[PDB]
Amino acid sequence: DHYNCVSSGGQCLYSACPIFTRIQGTCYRGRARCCR
């Protein structure tokens, strides 16, 4: 979820994860991705 994404050092996006990161889970009722 968003809170855990941010606490773990990731950020939520509705587009692709930046090339230097990879998906770690989801955010925002599952509609975004957590990237780190």
XYZ file of N, CA and C in Angstrom:
108
model
N 0.902 -1.208 0.000
C 0.000 0.000 0.000
C 0.902 1.208 0.000
N 0.301 2.398 -0.157
C 1.094 3.617 -0.220
C 1.967 3.836 1.022
N 1.412 3.701 2.225
C 2.152 3.979 3.444
C 3.374 3.053 3.504
N 3.178 1.756 3.251
C 4.307 0.850 3.320
C 5.296 1.053 2.231
N 4.824 1.383 1.028
C 5.727 1.671 -0.087
C 6.680 2.799 0.351
N 6.120 3.909 0.812
C 6.936 5.081 1.142
C 7.886 4.703 2.339
N 7.368 3.990 3.341
C 8.193 3.679 4.511
C 9.355 2.797 4.160
N 9.208 1.963 3.105
C 10.274 1.055 2.703
C 11.232 1.638 1.715
N 11.055 2.924 1.379
C 11.973 3.574 0.443
C 11.563 3.500 -1.004
N 10.297 3.194 -1.276
C 9.791 3.178 -2.631
C 8.903 4.380 -2.926
N 8.418 4.438 -4.146
C 7.390 5.426 -4.478
C 6.337 4.806 -5.367
N 5.133 5.321 -5.236
C 3.990 4.793 -6.020
C 3.884 5.492 -7.365
N 3.623 4.716 -8.411
C 3.418 5.278 -9.735
C 2.278 4.625 -10.465
N 1.597 5.387 -11.321
C 0.570 4.814 -12.175
C 1.140 4.490 -13.564
N 2.383 4.834 -13.814
C 3.092 4.472 -15.035
C 4.165 3.429 -14.732
N 5.017 3.090 -15.702
C 6.081 2.125 -15.459
C 7.026 2.606 -14.380
N 7.602 1.645 -13.649
C 8.637 1.998 -12.729
C 9.835 2.637 -13.472
N 10.482 3.622 -12.882
C 11.696 4.169 -13.516
C 12.672 3.021 -13.837
N 13.517 3.145 -14.882
C 14.341 2.035 -15.313
C 15.319 1.525 -14.225
N 15.725 2.375 -13.296
C 16.678 1.956 -12.254
C 15.972 1.277 -11.047
N 14.658 1.083 -11.127
C 13.884 0.487 -10.030
C 13.074 -0.685 -10.585
N 12.461 -1.429 -9.692
C 11.557 -2.542 -10.049
C 10.351 -2.547 -9.136
N 9.251 -3.160 -9.601
C 8.029 -3.218 -8.802
C 8.300 -4.057 -7.530
N 7.762 -3.553 -6.427
C 7.832 -4.203 -5.112
C 6.481 -4.577 -4.566
N 5.408 -4.123 -5.163
C 4.042 -4.348 -4.638
C 3.163 -3.248 -5.240
N 2.013 -3.011 -4.589
C 0.996 -2.160 -5.198
C 0.745 -0.954 -4.275
N 0.013 0.046 -4.788
C -0.475 1.151 -3.986
C -1.883 1.520 -4.482
N -2.591 2.291 -3.638
C -3.793 3.029 -4.027
C -4.870 2.081 -4.565
N -5.305 1.198 -3.665
C -6.394 0.237 -3.919
C -5.948 -0.638 -5.081
N -4.636 -0.916 -5.159
C -4.152 -1.849 -6.178
C -3.952 -1.284 -7.563
N -4.281 -0.003 -7.773
C -4.244 0.529 -9.141
C -2.912 1.129 -9.547
N -2.057 1.394 -8.559
C -0.691 1.852 -8.824
C 0.302 0.787 -8.389
N 1.546 1.033 -8.763
C 2.628 0.106 -8.399
C 3.645 0.785 -7.491
N 4.206 0.028 -6.550
C 5.279 0.531 -5.696
C 6.602 0.198 -6.364
N 7.435 1.203 -6.619
C 8.705 1.017 -7.295
C 9.848 1.369 -6.365
N 10.903 0.560 -6.411
C 12.105 0.802 -5.565
C 13.330 0.233 -6.252
